[PDB]
C-alpha cells in the first residue's frame, strides 16, 4: 500500500512515487473534487471503476477528476494508458476530515532517464 506523502505547506496536496507493484490508498471525503494528473503526453486508453455510480469521472487530456456520489463508496479505479496502468483503492472517509485535494506522482525511471 503506497500511502501518499503530503506537502509541508498544506497536507491537502499529496505526492506518491509510482510503482508497478503497489496500489495507492486514496482517502476521499464528501463534497470535494480531487485532481489527478498524468505524465506529459500520456494517452489515456480506458478506465474501469469497481462501482461506476459510486464516483463521478471526467477527464481532460492528462487531468483526471473523480468525485464521490454515494454513501459507502469503497471501490477501485484502474485507469490505463500506453505507458503504464494505475491502481487506486478508493476509500471514503466518514468524518470529512483528512481530505486529499490532489495526488501527484514522482517517477523513478523517468527521473533517472
Amino acid at each position: 500500500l503506497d500511502v501518499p506523502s503530503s506537502s509541508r505547506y498544506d497536507h491537502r496536496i499529496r505526492y506518491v512515487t509510482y510503482n508497478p507493484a503497489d496500489v495507492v490508498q486514496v482517502d476521499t471525503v464528501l463534497g470535494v473534487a480531487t485532481h489527478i494528473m498524468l505524465e506529459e503526453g500520456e494517452q489515456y486508453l480506458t478506465h474501469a471503476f469497481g462501482d461506476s455510480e459510486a464516483y463521478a469521472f471526467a477527464r481532460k487530456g492528462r487531468h483526471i477528476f473523480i468525485k464521490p456520489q454515494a454513501e459507502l463508496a469503497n471501490t477501485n479505479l484502474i485507469v490505463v494508458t500506453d505507458r503504464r496502468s494505475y491502481k487506486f483503492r478508493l476509500q471514503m472517509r466518514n468524518d470529512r476530515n483528512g481530505a486529499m485535494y490532489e495526488l501527484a506522482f514522482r517517477y523513478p525511471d523517468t527521473q533517472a532517464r
Partner: peptide
C-alpha cells in the same frame, strides 16, 4: 463534477447630352 417619335437615329444619338456631376470643395 461540472455544471452544464423615336426616329432620326444617327442625329439623335449624337445629341445625347453629356451631364457631368458638379463637385464640392473640401
Amino acid at each position: 463534477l461540472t455544471a452544464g417619335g423615336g426616329g432620326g437615329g444617327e442625329l439623335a444619338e449624337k445629341l445625347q447630352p453629356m451631364r457631368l456631376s458638379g463637385s464640392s470643395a473640401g
